[PDB]
Design a protein around this ligand. Structure first.
Ligand SMILES: CO[C@@H]1O[C@@H](C)Cc2oc3cc(O)c(O)c(C(=O)O)c3c(=O)c21
Ligand code: NA
Ligand SMILES: [Zn+2]
Ligand SMILES: [Zn+2]
Length: 227
């Protein structure tokens, strides 16, 4: 897991897919690593989630063209939080096509946050110059608008913050959560992606299909420890 900056780390899953970790300070939580993925194909790149601000985004964008030699032409945010579209303003200054769950669009619109240009309500297959990128909204969880991105040709699943990492014992920031549905949403995720090789969470180390079951119990535990 190489470093590309003082606050940005990279790991390589396959020849086309990468995962990055950007360090940032969040009032109330302190130093916290946020994950995102980079997908490449025929010199073009699709960025899933951006760091929390334009500086880290810019760095990350230049590293892609410099080390991977690819133009960032596509962006998909997991949901409306800072650790997903924090640096979308930058990306837009550079003409990047943005795609998101329609709800993410409405939330950013009313909160004066930069807005993505194409919403979907259930699913969206975005073609990165040939290579498919499948986005789905299977219900609320960490956030009401959260989606997942599936890569049919890599069996790699980007779950975002609806999925916690194996070393997590806390349910985390449930300020915009929909704990009522979260549990049902997780079931649909394991049902839909049985053969997932890699499963990347919004915070923490990646792993296999087991992060889904691990997160399912952190939540159930919470619904009852507070009920
Ligand atoms: C519990 O998991 C993580 O570990 C603890 C120590 C710190 C932490 O901080 C967070 C801060 C957020 O802004 C946020 O939105 C989440 C969140 O996604 O819930 C997390 C998050 O993931 C975690
Ligand atoms: Na991110
Ligand atoms: Zn979030
Ligand atoms: Zn998060």
């Amino acid at each position: 897991s190489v470093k590309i900056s003082d606050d940005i780390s990279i790991t390589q899953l396959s020849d086309k897919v990468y995962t990055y970790v950007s360090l940032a300070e969040i009032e109330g939580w302190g130093m916290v690593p946020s994950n995102g993925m980079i997908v490449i194909n025929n010199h073009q790149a699709a960025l899933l989630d951006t760091p929390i601000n334009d500086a880290q985004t810019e760095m990350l964008v230049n590293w892609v063209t410099d080390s991977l030699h690819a133009k960032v032409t596509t962006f998909i945010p997991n949901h409306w939080h800072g650790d997903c579209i924090g640096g979308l303003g930058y990306l837009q200054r550079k003409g990047v096509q943005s795609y998101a769950n329609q709800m993410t669009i409405d939330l950013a619109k009313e909160k004066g946050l930069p807005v993505p240009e194409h919403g979907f309500t259930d699913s969206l297959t975005v073609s990165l110059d040939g290579m498919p990128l499948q986005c789905y909204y299977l219900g609320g969880g960490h956030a009401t608008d959260n989606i997942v991105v599936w890569l049919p040709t890599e069996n790699i699943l980007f779950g975002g913050c609806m999925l916690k990492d194996n070393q997590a014992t806390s349910i985390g920031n449930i300020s915009d959560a929909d704990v009522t549905a979260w549990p049902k949403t997780l079931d649909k995720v394991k049902a839909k992606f049985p053969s997932a090789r890699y499963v990347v969470p919004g915070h923490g180390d990646y792993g296999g299909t087991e992060l889904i079951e691990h997160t399912k119990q952190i939540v159930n535990q919470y619904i009852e420890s507070t009920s």
